[PDB]
């Protein structure tokens, strides 16, 4: 047992420094109690006990006076329901006074908050307050303030959050102020460091490929400095650019592995090149990163580093590693030997605009993993910026750039998706800057859809789709669009995630995934495109229906009582082929059946047969509803790029694509709702609120059926 072990070695096995297990002998009582108190925790506990539960278990036997109640407190703190000290410093005083032992759990449970949860968001909260309540005086003082202060304020919001937990959040949002002190399974389980494989924060060296310079270890400290060893992370778009099914993985990947490790990670837009702001696009993607669950640490631009890109740049030719290029459209050149002075002369001639577009280029003097010859580091280009403005004429190619600005972002893992890999560490080990490690996933994509921005938007000039917004695409916007539920996504990559590789998928496993969900979420109500008037044989002259079938707990909805209801042009026939032809009240046979000019059935009538088989779905007091039904853009799901012989990206287009509807008759529940909060029509299945829709003028989009076969 534990109980078994010298009184020295018990201490340091609840993890007690030897040097206060020292201590802790010496006192005869406490030793002999907290002995006790560690027997009858792992006589109830039934295992090797914890090391946090150890610095209670020692608390517990250093204060507890009331010796009488010791088996009762140990209880609470072996189940952890008590773990900590401010939980622990309550039910301590609870005891010294209510000395009678009838001791309500209730009165006694309440007044400890034992079954209290306390988020991160909260203490991030807290401190964040705490910090803005001190802000300039902590700017000032720097790192002589009174962090004391912070903890303090911060502890009197959270009356039983872990201590240290708090100083942890308070020592991270204080260094981000002030800066260095220079003196199938679940998903963020997932994503996990450990569960990995990914390197820790500050050991870059043990991943493969690492170059290790004589600084590498004097880099990787200061880094430590700059980041207190914090997993950062990236994720970097075009600020002009369309964002595609594809980076929900990109974004889940990045974001998701900064959450799941208290990381924090930047959305740093690669604009490196000037063009105008398509501001429709930029928004969306600042928008499509929230809707799907995530909160950037910081946005930044990566024109927010030309300065310092720039600077390396020249320190690159100074090392003989770069020259200036007076090339065209791999063949060698002239150029690439030049004199060092000379490539320093023409790289400030060419920022003080002195050569037209292309006469002249700074390239990189290397070869690399696949035999392409001096890359490019900086182009001419005169185009203004959208943020610098005419500041600059020369700009860092992709390549030079989203390299160097991980290592000014001190970035610790830097993904991306699957080539030449280690011309990354290229640079960074040629200028002795920090050095991030890249790993890489692989290539979501899935079986029908075209992304390319160019192909898409001519898709919206060609009339073949609505906007970039259509459903029909796979544009984050438009599955948005068709209501398909964030959760539903971010659950998607937790069943089919990891770094494989171009493991592109067909469409129906991401709708399963999108049901699953919108099946718990998503309440329910009825209507029909094909409708058709039913008036009836007279009827007693408020039904009342379901929120969620499967558990009633929601509390159910309002619907009308008329007489003159509607249905499906699809469910009554004439000669049954069996098929039918209600969902509360009645039966309501059929007496006498219409027609009109030709077979047309204008109208229907009905009995009482109140109180066998197929029941259906109808609607009185209906409201008039707008529909779009959409089927599948391309005919060819497998990829609809010349993959097989199509010879066309515009030519294996179903024409089908959506029907409109009638503004069909549509249930009265879904009457006070906003775009996007998509429910369940019991008929077909599942459909969501266009942002169309006024009050008055509802529409809705057809998401997904209810199975596949």
């Not at 996504?489 to 999108?514: D, K, S």
């Not at 179903?654 to 069909?664: E, G, K, M, T």
Request: one cysteine or more.
């Amino acid at each position: 047992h534990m109980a078994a072990l010298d009184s020295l070695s018990l201490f340091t096995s609840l993890g007690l420094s030897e040097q206060k297990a020292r201590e802790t002998l010496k006192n005869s009582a406490l030793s002999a109690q907290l002995r006790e108190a560690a027997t009858q925790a792992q006589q109830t506990l039934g295992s090797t006990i914890d090391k946090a539960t150890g610095i209670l278990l020692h608390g517990l036997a250093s204060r507890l006076r009331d010796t009488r109640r010791l088996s009762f407190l140990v209880s609470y703190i072996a189940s952890k329901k008590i773990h900590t000290e401010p939980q622990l410093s309550a039910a301590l005083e609870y005891v010294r006074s209510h000395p009678l032992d009838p001791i309500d759990t209730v009165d006694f449970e309440r007044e400890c908050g034992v079954g209290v949860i306390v988020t991160p968001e909260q203490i991030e909260e807290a401190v964040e307050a705490a910090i803005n309540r001190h802000r300039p005086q902590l700017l000032v003082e720097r790192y002589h303030f009174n962090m004391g202060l912070l903890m303090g304020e911060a502890r009197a919001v959270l009356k039983w959050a872990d201590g240290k937990m708090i100083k942890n959040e308070v020592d991270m949002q204080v260094l981000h102020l002030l800066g260095p002190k220079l003196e199938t399974l679940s998903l963020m389980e997932q994503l996990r460091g450990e569960a990995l494989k990914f390197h820790k924060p500050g050991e870059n060296y043990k991943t493969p490929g690492y170059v290790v310079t004589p600084h590498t270890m004097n880099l990787l400290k200061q880094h430590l400095e700059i980041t207190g060893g914090q997993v950062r992370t990236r994720f970097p778009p075009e600020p002009n650019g369309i964002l595609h099914i594809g980076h929900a993985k990109a974004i889940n990947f990045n974001f998701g592995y900064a959450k799941a490790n208290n990381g924090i990670c930047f959305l740093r837009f690669d604009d490196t090149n000037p063009e105008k702001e398509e501001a429709k696009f930029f928004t969306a993607i600042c928008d499509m990163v929230a809707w799907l669950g995530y909160t950037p640490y910081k946005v930044t631009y990566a024109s927010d580093y030309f300065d310092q890109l720039y600077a390396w740049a020249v320190e690159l030719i100074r090392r003989g590693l770069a020259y200036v290029c007076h090339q065209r459209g791999t063949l060698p050149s002239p150029w690439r030997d030049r004199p060092m002075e000379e490539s320093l002369l023409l790289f400030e001639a060419m920022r003080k605009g002195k050569f037209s577009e292309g006469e002249a280029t700074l390239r990189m003097k290397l070869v690399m993993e696949d035999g392409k010859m001096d890359p490019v580091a900086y182009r001419v280009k005169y185009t203004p910026h959208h943020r610098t403005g005419d500041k600059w004429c020369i700009y860092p190619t992709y390549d030079y750039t989203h390299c160097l600005c991980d290592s000014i972002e001190h970035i610790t893992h830097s993904l991306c998706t699957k080539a030449r890999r280690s011309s990354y560490f290229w640079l960074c080990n040629a200028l002795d800057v920090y050095c991030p490690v890249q790993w890489e996933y692989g290539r979501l994509n899935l079986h029908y859809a075209v992304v390319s921005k160019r192909k898409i938007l001519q898709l919206v000039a060609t009339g073949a789709v609505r906007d970039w917004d259509d459903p029909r695409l796979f544009t984050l916007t438009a599955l948005r669009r068709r209501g398909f539920p964030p959760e539903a996504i971010n659950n998607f990559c937790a069943r089919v995630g990891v770094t494989v590789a171009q493991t592109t998928m067909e469409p129906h496993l991401l709708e399963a995934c999108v049901r699953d969900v919108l099946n718990d979420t998503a309440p329910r109500a009825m209507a029909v495109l094909e409708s058709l008037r039913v008036i009836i044989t007279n009827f007693p002259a408020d039904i009342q229906v379901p929120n969620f079938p499967a558990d009633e707990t929601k509390g159910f909805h309002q619907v009308p009582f008329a007489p003159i209801v509607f249905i499906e042009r699809t469910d009554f026939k004439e000669e049954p082929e069996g098929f039918k032809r209600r969902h509360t009240g009645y039966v309501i046979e059929l007496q006498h059946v219409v027609k009109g000019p030709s077979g047309c059935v204008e109208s229907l009538e009905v009995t009482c047969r109140r109180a066998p088989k197929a029941f259906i779905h109808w609607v009185s007091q209906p409201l008039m509803c707008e529909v779009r039904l959409y089927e599948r853009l391309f005919q060819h799901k497998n990829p609809e790029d010349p993959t097989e012989v199509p010879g066309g990206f515009l030519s294996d287009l179903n024409l089908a694509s959506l029907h409109v509807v009638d503004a069909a008759l549509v249930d009265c529940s879904v009457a006070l709702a906003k775009p996007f909060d998509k429910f369940q029509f019991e008929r077909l299945g599942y459909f969501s609120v266009d942002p169309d829709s006024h009050q008055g003028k509802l529409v809705f989009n057809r998401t997904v059926t209810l199975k596949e076969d």
